[PDB]
Amino acid sequence: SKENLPWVEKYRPETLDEVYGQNEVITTVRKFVDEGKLPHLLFYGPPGTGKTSTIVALAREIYGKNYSNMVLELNASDDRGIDVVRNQIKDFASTRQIFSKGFKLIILDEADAMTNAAQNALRRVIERYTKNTRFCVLANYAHKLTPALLSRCTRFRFQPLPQEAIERRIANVLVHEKLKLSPNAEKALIELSNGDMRRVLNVLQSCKATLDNPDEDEISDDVIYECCGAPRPSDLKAVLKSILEDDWGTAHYTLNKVRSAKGLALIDLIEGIVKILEDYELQNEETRVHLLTKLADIEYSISKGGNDQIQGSAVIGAIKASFENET
Amino acid sequence: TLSLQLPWVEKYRPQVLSDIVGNKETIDRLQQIAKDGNMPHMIISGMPGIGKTTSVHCLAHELLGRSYADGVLELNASDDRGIDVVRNQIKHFAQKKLHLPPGKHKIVILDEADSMTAGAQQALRRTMELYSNSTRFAFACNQSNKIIEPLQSRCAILRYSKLSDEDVLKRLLQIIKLEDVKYTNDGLEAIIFTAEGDMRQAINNLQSTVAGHGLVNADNVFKIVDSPHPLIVKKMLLASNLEDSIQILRTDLWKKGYSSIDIVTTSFRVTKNLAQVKESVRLEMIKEIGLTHMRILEGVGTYLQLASMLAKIHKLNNK
Amino acid sequence: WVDKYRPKSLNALSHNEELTNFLKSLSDQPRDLPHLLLYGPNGTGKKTRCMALLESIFGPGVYRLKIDVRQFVTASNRKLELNVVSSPYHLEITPSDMGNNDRIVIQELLKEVAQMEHRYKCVIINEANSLTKDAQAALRRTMEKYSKNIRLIMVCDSMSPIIAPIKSRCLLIRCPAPSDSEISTILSDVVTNERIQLETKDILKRIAQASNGNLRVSLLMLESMALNNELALKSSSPIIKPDWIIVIHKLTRKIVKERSVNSLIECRAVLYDLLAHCIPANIILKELTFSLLDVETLNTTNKSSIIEYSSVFDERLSLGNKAIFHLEGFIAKVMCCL
Amino acid sequence: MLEAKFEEASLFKRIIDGFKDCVQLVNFQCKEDGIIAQAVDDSRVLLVSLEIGVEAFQEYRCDHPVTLGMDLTSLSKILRCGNNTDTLTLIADNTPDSIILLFEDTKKDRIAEYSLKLMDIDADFLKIEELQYDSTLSLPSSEFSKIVRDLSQLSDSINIMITKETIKFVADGDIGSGSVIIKPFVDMEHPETSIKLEMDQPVDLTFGAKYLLDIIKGSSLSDRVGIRLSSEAPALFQFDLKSGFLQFFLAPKF
Amino acid sequence: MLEAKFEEASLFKRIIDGFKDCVQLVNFQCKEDGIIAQAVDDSRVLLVSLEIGVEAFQEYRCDHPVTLGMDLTSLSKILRCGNNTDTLTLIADNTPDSIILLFEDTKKDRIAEYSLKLMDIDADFLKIEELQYDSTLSLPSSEFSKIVRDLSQLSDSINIMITKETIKFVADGDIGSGSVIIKPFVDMEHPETSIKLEMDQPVDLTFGAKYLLDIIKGSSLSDRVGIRLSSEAPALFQFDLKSGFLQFFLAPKFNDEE
Amino acid sequence: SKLAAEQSLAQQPWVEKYRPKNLDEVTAQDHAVTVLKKTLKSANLPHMLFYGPPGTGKTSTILALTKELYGPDLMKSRILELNASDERGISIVREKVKNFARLTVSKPSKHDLENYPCPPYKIIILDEADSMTADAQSALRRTMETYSGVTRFCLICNYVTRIIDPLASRCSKFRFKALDASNAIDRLRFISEQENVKCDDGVLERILDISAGDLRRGITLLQSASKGAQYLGDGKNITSTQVEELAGVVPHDILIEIVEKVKSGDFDEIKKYVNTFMKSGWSAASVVNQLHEYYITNDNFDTNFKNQISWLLFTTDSRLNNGTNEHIQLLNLLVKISQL
DNA sequence: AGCAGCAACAGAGAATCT
DNA sequence: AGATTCTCTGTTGCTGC
Numbered sequence A: 001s002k003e004n005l006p007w008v009e010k011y012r013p014e015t016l017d018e019v020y021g022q023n024e025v026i027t028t029v030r031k032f033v034d035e036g037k038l039p040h041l042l043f044y045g046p047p048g049t050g051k052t053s054t055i056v057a058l059a060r061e062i063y064g065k066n067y068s069n070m071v072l073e074l075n076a077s078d079d080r081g082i083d084v085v086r087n088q089i090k091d092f093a094s095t096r097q098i099f100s101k102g103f104k105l106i107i108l109d110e111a112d113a114m115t116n117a118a119q120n121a122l123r124r125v126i127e128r129y130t131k132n133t134r135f136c137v138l139a140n141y142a143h144k145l146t147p148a149l150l151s152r153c154t155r156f157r158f159q160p161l162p163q164e165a166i167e168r169r170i171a172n173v174l175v176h177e178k179l180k181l182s183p184n185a186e187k188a189l190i191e192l193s194n195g196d197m198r199r200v201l202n203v204l205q206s207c208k209a210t211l212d213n214p215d216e217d218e219i220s221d222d223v224i225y226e227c228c229g230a231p232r233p234s235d236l237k238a239v240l241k242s243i244l245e246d247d248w249g250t251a252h253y254t255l256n257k258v259r260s261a262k263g264l265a266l267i268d269l270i271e272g273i274v275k276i277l278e279d280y281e282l283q284n285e286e287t288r289v290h291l292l293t294k295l296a297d298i299e300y301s302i303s304k305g306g307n308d309q310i311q312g313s314a315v316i317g318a319i320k321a322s323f324e325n326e327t
Numbered sequence B: 001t002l003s004l005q006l007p008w009v010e011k012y013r014p015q016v017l018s019d020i021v022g023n024k025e026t027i028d029r030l031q032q033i034a035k036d037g038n039m040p041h042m043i044i045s046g047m048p049g050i051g052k053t054t055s056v057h058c059l060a061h062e063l064l065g066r067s068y069a070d071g072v073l074e075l076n077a078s079d080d081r082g083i084d085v086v087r088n089q090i091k092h093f094a095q096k097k098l099h100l101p102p103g104k105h106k107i108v109i110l111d112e113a114d115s116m117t118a119g120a121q122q123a124l125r126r127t128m129e130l131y132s133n134s135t136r137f138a139f140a141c142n143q144s145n146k147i148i149e150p151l152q153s154r155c156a157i158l159r160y161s162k163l164s165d166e167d168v169l170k171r172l173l174q175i176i177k178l179e180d181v182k183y184t185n186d187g188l189e190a191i192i193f194t195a196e197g198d199m200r201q202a203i204n205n206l207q208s209t210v211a212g213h214g215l216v217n218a219d220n221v222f223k224i225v226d227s228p229h230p231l232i233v234k235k236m237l238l239a240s241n242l243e244d245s246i247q248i249l250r251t252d253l254w255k256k257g258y259s260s261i262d263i264v265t266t267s268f269r270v271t272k273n274l275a276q277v278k279e280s281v282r283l284e285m286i287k288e289i290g291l292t293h294m295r296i297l298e299g300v301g302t303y304l305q306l307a308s309m310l311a312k313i314h315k316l317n318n319k
Numbered sequence C: 001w002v003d004k005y006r007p008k009s010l011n012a013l014s015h016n017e018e019l020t021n022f023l024k025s026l027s028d029q030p031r032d033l034p035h036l037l038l039y040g041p042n043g044t045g046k047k048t049r050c051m052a053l054l055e056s057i058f059g060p061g062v063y064r065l066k067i068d069v070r071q072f073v074t075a076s077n078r079k080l081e082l083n084v085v086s087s088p089y090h091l092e093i094t095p096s097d098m099g100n101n102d103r104i105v106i107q108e109l110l111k112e113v114a115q116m117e118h119r120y121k122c123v124i125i126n127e128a129n130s131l132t133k134d135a136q137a138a139l140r141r142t143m144e145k146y147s148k149n150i151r152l153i154m155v156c157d158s159m160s161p162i163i164a165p166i167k168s169r170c171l172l173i174r175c176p177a178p179s180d181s182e183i184s185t186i187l188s189d190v191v192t193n194e195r196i197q198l199e200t201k202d203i204l205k206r207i208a209q210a211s212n213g214n215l216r217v218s219l220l221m222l223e224s225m226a227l228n229n230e231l232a233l234k235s236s237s238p239i240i241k242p243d244w245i246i247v248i249h250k251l252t253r254k255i256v257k258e259r260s261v262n263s264l265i266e267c268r269a270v271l272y273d274l275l276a277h278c279i280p281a282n283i284i285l286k287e288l289t290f291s292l293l294d295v296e297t298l299n300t301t302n303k304s305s306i307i308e309y310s311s312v313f314d315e316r317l318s319l320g321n322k323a324i325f326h327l328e329g330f331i332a333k334v335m336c337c338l
Numbered sequence D: 001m002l003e004a005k006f007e008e009a010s011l012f013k014r015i016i017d018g019f020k021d022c023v024q025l026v027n028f029q030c031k032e033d034g035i036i037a038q039a040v041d042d043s044r045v046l047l048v049s050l051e052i053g054v055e056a057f058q059e060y061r062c063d064h065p066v067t068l069g070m071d072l073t074s075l076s077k078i079l080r081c082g083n084n085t086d087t088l089t090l091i092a093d094n095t096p097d098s099i100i101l102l103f104e105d106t107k108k109d110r111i112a113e114y115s116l117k118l119m120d121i122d123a124d125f126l127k128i129e130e131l132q133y134d135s136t137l138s139l140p141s142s143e144f145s146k147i148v149r150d151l152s153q154l155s156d157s158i159n160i161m162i163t164k165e166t167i168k169f170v171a172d173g174d175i176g177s178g179s180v181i182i183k184p185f186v187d188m189e190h191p192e193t194s195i196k197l198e199m200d201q202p203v204d205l206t207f208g209a210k211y212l213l214d215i216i217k218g219s220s221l222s223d224r225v226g227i228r229l230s231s232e233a234p235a236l237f238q239f240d241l242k243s244g245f246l247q248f249f250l251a252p253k254f
Numbered sequence E: 001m002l003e004a005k006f007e008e009a010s011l012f013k014r015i016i017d018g019f020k021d022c023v024q025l026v027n028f029q030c031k032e033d034g035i036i037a038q039a040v041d042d043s044r045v046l047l048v049s050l051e052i053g054v055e056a057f058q059e060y061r062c063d064h065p066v067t068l069g070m071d072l073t074s075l076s077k078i079l080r081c082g083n084n085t086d087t088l089t090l091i092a093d094n095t096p097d098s099i100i101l102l103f104e105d106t107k108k109d110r111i112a113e114y115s116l117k118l119m120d121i122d123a124d125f126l127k128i129e130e131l132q133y134d135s136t137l138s139l140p141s142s143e144f145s146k147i148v149r150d151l152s153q154l155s156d157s158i159n160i161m162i163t164k165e166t167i168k169f170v171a172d173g174d175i176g177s178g179s180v181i182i183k184p185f186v187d188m189e190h191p192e193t194s195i196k197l198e199m200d201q202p203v204d205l206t207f208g209a210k211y212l213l214d215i216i217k218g219s220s221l222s223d224r225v226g227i228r229l230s231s232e233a234p235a236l237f238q239f240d241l242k243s244g245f246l247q248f249f250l251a252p253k254f255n256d257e258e
Numbered sequence F: 001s002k003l004a005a006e007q008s009l010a011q012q013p014w015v016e017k018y019r020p021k022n023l024d025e026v027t028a029q030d031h032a033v034t035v036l037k038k039t040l041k042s043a044n045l046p047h048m049l050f051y052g053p054p055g056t057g058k059t060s061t062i063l064a065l066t067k068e069l070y071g072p073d074l075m076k077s078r079i080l081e082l083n084a085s086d087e088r089g090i091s092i093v094r095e096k097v098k099n100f101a102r103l104t105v106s107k108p109s110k111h112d113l114e115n116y117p118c119p120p121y122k123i124i125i126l127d128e129a130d131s132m133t134a135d136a137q138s139a140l141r142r143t144m145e146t147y148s149g150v151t152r153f154c155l156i157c158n159y160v161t162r163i164i165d166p167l168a169s170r171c172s173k174f175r176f177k178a179l180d181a182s183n184a185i186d187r188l189r190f191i192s193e194q195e196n197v198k199c200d201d202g203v204l205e206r207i208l209d210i211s212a213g214d215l216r217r218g219i220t221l222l223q224s225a226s227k228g229a230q231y232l233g234d235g236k237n238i239t240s241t242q243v244e245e246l247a248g249v250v251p252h253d254i255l256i257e258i259v260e261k262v263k264s265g266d267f268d269e270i271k272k273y274v275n276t277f278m279k280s281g282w283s284a285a286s287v288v289n290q291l292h293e294y295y296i297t298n299d300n301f302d303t304n305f306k307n308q309i310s311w312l313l314f315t316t317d318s319r320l321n322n323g324t325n326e327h328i329q330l331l332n333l334l335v336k337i338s339q340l
Numbered sequence G: 001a002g003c004a005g006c007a008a009c010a011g012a013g014a015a016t017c018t
Numbered sequence H: 001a002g003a004t005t006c007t008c009t010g011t012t013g014c015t016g017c
């Protein structure tokens, strides 16, 4: 049953009308398929944007419910070498369908992990067998693909999910589940997503589990922040104010009590302070240079461990010394 | 839907050497060779999508006439091209008896010659030397340095260059006339700008824009085929003030879904190939772009690292 | 000799009485014993104290040990060859005898010893600082999965390269270097047992002042200078210094005397000759910097820059593999500073 | 539940030999009228389809169909314990995580029993067989194997061409070309050697030699092989069993 | 001196086939009552021990024992010249640097003679056989080979369990588990197919499948195999010869010990 | 059977003796165990990614969850645990992990369904995912994306940055918080009472203060203090000084001597005192941490001095976190802070 | 200090011929 | 029925990226 799959897998789009966020590419692909001229596609974009769902729904709309048989889907989990290409992909492209009549579809998902020799062998397979089969390459990084292979396909960039589409999907999930969500809670949820539907679905399931109730109540900002462990804008701005204006010992005490009262992480506070200070209209860019350099150094040091108190004091001192040049 | 139509790159693929709008010198050279005969061993190098495979295909077709089926041996990178293949099949084809006109020869086309192993390339030397009177070799590669010098010593070297704006514009105008498409000057200009000397990519973008919107206009081309990635990165690095570069990185690159690895790597390429600033400042910018890369390869790839890289580059440019 | 007079039990220790009492406390109940990590200066006597603690956890047969050999296969049939020190109650492995293949030996050998098993068999990991981060990560879960059959006693000189999970997974025991007085008392018993002739006792103190807490170096230097004075130490017996220390001192003299590229070439040559004779580059850098700071011709401004450059290039050497590439850079930076 | 006892473990071993190598995953389904199994190779050009009726077994009981998927390699690894003459019983509950293979000798003596781990495969049996094919022919399977083994050496493609009273196999590659021409004929001295051909329309199809080579294995299950060709669908090569058949559907090269 | 003539070179070739692969060095010793040989693998979990009495030979003369060590691989390389029906004579002086293998056909015609270089091995023959084992069983060796070949595919460990009137071989690994259960029985229609079992105490030991696979080779020397198991010592698998025997002693896995 | 397990636990060190067996034993990581308890009644366990400081209880939490889910019978049949002591290349991830994921779930027994929920999926956990290469990690993407109906993936790591972005997006991120005195004093007091650890008033809270968010190190220090107090047999209570002595903490007077040498003194005196201090074995990380606490906490230094001392201590800790020589780094730090 | 892709060599199994 | 030869598969080593 579908009630056992996680929310990321349960709510996977099955038709092209359930893929939100991407409109300019979805309409163009629908027109390509209706008019017949479907070229070799290259879906490039960040994780969680809906490239795999888009191509799966496309193959479903093209071949019907028997998609799992008329399409050759290869990914990084499967062995994709040059010999694998030579045998499997060439035998698939050269032959025809065993279930119906029509062009074939080869979905090379996550093809950014393929060997250079494999791409060099495939770039002539795409150019030779082009009247009976098509190629779809999904990628997160366009630098791992050879320029020859990159030039044979039409590139579609999957933009991050905007506010309207992600709110539409959230409303769809809140309709499918016996769940209510606060408006400010929804805004905070959209803020900690960066256009990643996977994160939204995961944390929505997690905060529904956090409710502890038969779901007669609502999900507020407190639930989201306590479940995702993300700092609140209130505590963020309080720490920033105490760092910018208050005394050194008082700033240290404030940072300690804020990061220990809710168990917040220093890296999340660093990213939040970076995001907040990005809107600050500042004087001569030397302060911004020092701030960015020191904050990136502290983040790279945190990414390897160390003393949290020493790193917090380093953040405080870096912000203070950076702002001391603004006078 | 039941079947698709042939793409314009394959449908309008040139079949005669006159239809090629590539490098005029080498094109007339190959045309005179096909007219007179006595085709020598050749290695055609260049960049993807400029008319290298089509050129050698047209040359072989025009030179062999109807005997193309039994006189031309095509081997691509999709087929096994190791030492065993060169030893058995290529040698059997070169030793094969075939009655040809007194001006033609058997042609062995080897696509993607830069991918053949060292053993096969070494074995091909005497293979092409002992049968150089009834078998000729034509290599098509992108990097001539990947082919050993002994093989390059026995053949001509044809280096294909990028296609100027005029040639791609003329070819696109011919395709539009042959297809009856509604277009405009700014749309074709945007297409050629996003092509970057790539004729195949230009025709592909044109066909995609036609099948997606019908009218080839700059707005449609820009909304379907995003502007060149390296140009926005160059404009970001060449910014004079830190806030302008930060806003460019935020809106154009980060808010549109470009990964940090692509941004930093495109950034490295732009710098390496930069010519506006001096050598020392370019080396310092490349050095800074490197630490950000090392930190991103270690999994610390975020917007703060790119912001710090830009800040360090500006500090270097800050005398 | 160092080996002829060495304690074999906890009651035979003659310095750090608080550490001996802590070891006796830890060995009172031996079955509920967690993993241990002995850290401190090199030459303090932690490897003797670990064996003395094993002598309290088990019978006196812990010292009757044997050397065996075990072969391993990496991806290549290359048979990594590793010798093992084994005892009927414990075993000792030194992953510092190979390159980046520490993880394979660690995981395979420890899994074999843990699957075969007072009730547990002790494991002594010698020189845990040379353990690569991947080998330490592999040992991280092996320390916890098999805690009723395998107990680790890791001997190291500095917990700086040891990862935080391993640090947390074992008790930490510090071994401070013995005071000059205890070293002098030990040397007194040694010279009365080895029948050495001392005109004045204070020379022994000077030996301590020349060893910097190292007992292994102290006894060896005492015996080396006892052979030059023919078993009769006088009031002004010269101090026997190792050859590499003299080479480093001459290198610092050359550094402070001449600062040029022509001298940088011979400095690189001296560094090559030192590295080719089984001398680590970190110790070379440490001794070079410490003896350069002792140069009275320089001032505080020079010494501060010297120590900063030495820290920077020590980080470089800990992050690099071509040690001379960092040593020559540090030497050039010091030349530019002076 | 699954409860199927083969008189001779050998029959099952030869059947599996047919799926062997050319496919990795097989989906079995037992039911009231027997057992069926389907396997498709990765490139999707070959489908191996089996049908064993109730009468092919010495004992068969089914009150509740069971579908089970498995790795063929794992299955064949275990399929060499049959002594050929051993008795083989396939056993599984209604919601299995494994399939039990039980080999026993006549006497109580030796009992080899295996418990093979199953794979979850989305049930999706194909029904691509045609009502009528352009041409139909049968001939001794050993003869078909030789024909395939001959030509295979010359090319990676073997063409089958059918015209009135003529069947022609052709391969053409680097070293040269080859052809095998056979004609329909009834041998009364023993009709298992005859070559029948019913042509409604001349056909001319090309197949990848590597696949025909996989298919010839069926010779070990039947004396004759039936080949049905069409320009509209995958070709069918069929090997009849006593109550059943092993079928190979192969898509022609485009 | 060493002077042992085998009627058929084949017997010696099959005997050496038994040491083959699983051991590298073999130490032979000829004496007044015959020839013995011992070989231990590198991990020391398997000992191969041979005994050939004087009566197994067509001619045997020994007035002075000789001990000689050699590389097994070198020996087998030379052990395919026997034509099986050829006559084989092993020859060596009292202080040998080599061992001479002399193959001759009935008629004076073909004489193939080899001079194999010897290795110096510290003489240290083991005597690990027990007086009584927990359980003893014999069964056709071809049956034992099949049992081992079955289970081997499933795991690197094969367990042998013995209870009253029951012998059970079991393997359990990744793809699943398997077991072969056999019961004692006397077949008068030909007793070489019977399965005997004498159990003084139930036993349950695990062995490394790679080693049992080496051991099954003895089938070529005898119709039956004797298996003696104990919880106190290496298991003994024995293949009888006419006047002699080939024995394999295998240490049970402790949990991980071949 | 069970009694042998009880005795082996009783003869086991306190770290493994008091390992959380149920989801209720988790004292401080409540946000994660609440979701884990809620999904125990449902059947929609998503792919999870535990990350946080070492010793926070990630492995213990996942073990307790798998136990409460499957029972001690299915605990060994529906779990695939891969640690850092095993090979986890592309070959292993493609063969073994994918074969286990593609396999069907084992049939539960009659006693399993009566007491445990027995979900229709199995669990594949990968402990210490920091050592996994990024290509072997990307190989797991579709493996965990397509076979989610039959298996669930649980990644465990300390640095969440070492895991690629797609894997971090596919799994639900669970951040384990540091276990300071506040949220772990209850667990420490429970461990002390269960072992009759007679201590003073401010010992346990001090122990966690030395632990810096690490309950494993705190339990180890408590066990060491209890052993040292039982060996003496005086019947007194453990003191905070006795605890900080064996914890590697430099005494207050020795640190005040360092402060005096830094404040007043030249390069030579500071170098000599550092050479003397390095003779007594102290961890440079602890000395740097104590100096940082003293300098930032003391309200007698200028803010301009405080920014510089914070940056210098940060640089020194970052350099020490790479395996450098403690003596050189400590001397450089003290010299740099003496010039201020 | 992986992998991979490789290619070559050796061993084992199956088939055919005497 | 046994022996020999040929073919196929697997493992190891070397080279290149």
Ligand SMILES: Nc1ncnc2c1ncn2[C@@H]1O[C@H](COP(=O)(O)OP(=O)(O)OP(O)(O)=S)[C@@H](O)[C@H]1O
Pocket: A007, A008, A009, A011, A012, A013, A018, A019, A020, A021, A022, A046, A047, A048, A049, A050, A051, A052, A053, A054, A139, A140, A161, A169, A197, A198, A201, F166, F169
């Ligand atoms: N545009 C979208 N509309 C609705 N749901 C979406 C959308 N994009 C992602 N999702 C959800 O996120 C899940 C994962 O989507 P995927 O297509 O697998 O992500 P992706 O774009 O392929 O990025 P990868 O796989 O990490 S490279 C889907 O099953 C949906 O539940």
Ligand SMILES: Nc1ncnc2c1ncn2[C@@H]1O[C@H](COP(=O)(O)OP(=O)(O)OP(O)(O)=S)[C@@H](O)[C@H]1O
Pocket: A148, B008, B009, B010, B012, B013, B014, B019, B020, B021, B022, B047, B048, B049, B050, B051, B052, B053, B054, B055, B141, B142, B171, B199, B200, B203
């Ligand atoms: N000079 C040209 N004139 C007309 N069409 C061209 C020209 N060059 C390329 N094209 C088009 O581009 C398609 C592909 O050209 P190719 O010759 O295959 O590219 P290439 O120069 O060989 O670079 P590769 O194959 O990536 S190494 C042709 O089928 C044409 O449609």
Ligand SMILES: Nc1ncnc2c1ncn2[C@@H]1O[C@H](COP(=O)(O)OP(=O)(O)OP(O)(O)=S)[C@@H](O)[C@H]1O
Pocket: C144, C165, F014, F015, F016, F018, F019, F020, F025, F026, F027, F028, F029, F053, F054, F055, F056, F057, F058, F059, F060, F061, F157, F158, F187, F215, F216, F219
């Ligand atoms: N939240 C907790 N509640 C109770 N005991 C805990 C808790 N966290 C850790 N412990 C104790 O610390 C021991 C180690 O737990 P682990 O789960 O291995 O720590 P960890 O988070 O895995 O650290 P690693 O493995 O270095 S990342 C457990 O056996 C407990 O005794």
Ligand SMILES: Nc1ncnc2c1ncn2[C@@H]1O[C@H](COP(=O)(O)OP(=O)(O)O)[C@@H](O)[C@H]1O
Pocket: C002, C003, C005, C006, C007, C012, C013, C014, C015, C042, C043, C044, C045, C046, C047, C048, C049, C186, C214, C215, C216, C217, C219
């Ligand atoms: N308790 C002790 N009393 C006297 N000498 C000792 C004692 N412990 C160790 N020593 C000696 O002091 C020196 C210490 O150096 P070494 O043994 O190498 O240290 P470690 O045990 O840390 O490796 C050796 O000569 C050693 O035998």
Ligand SMILES: [Mg+2]
Pocket: A051, A052, A109, A110, A138
């Ligand atoms: Mg995807």
Ligand SMILES: [Mg+2]
Pocket: B052, B053, B054, B111
């Ligand atoms: Mg080309």
Ligand SMILES: [Mg+2]
Pocket: F058, F059, F127, F128, F156
């Ligand atoms: Mg853990």
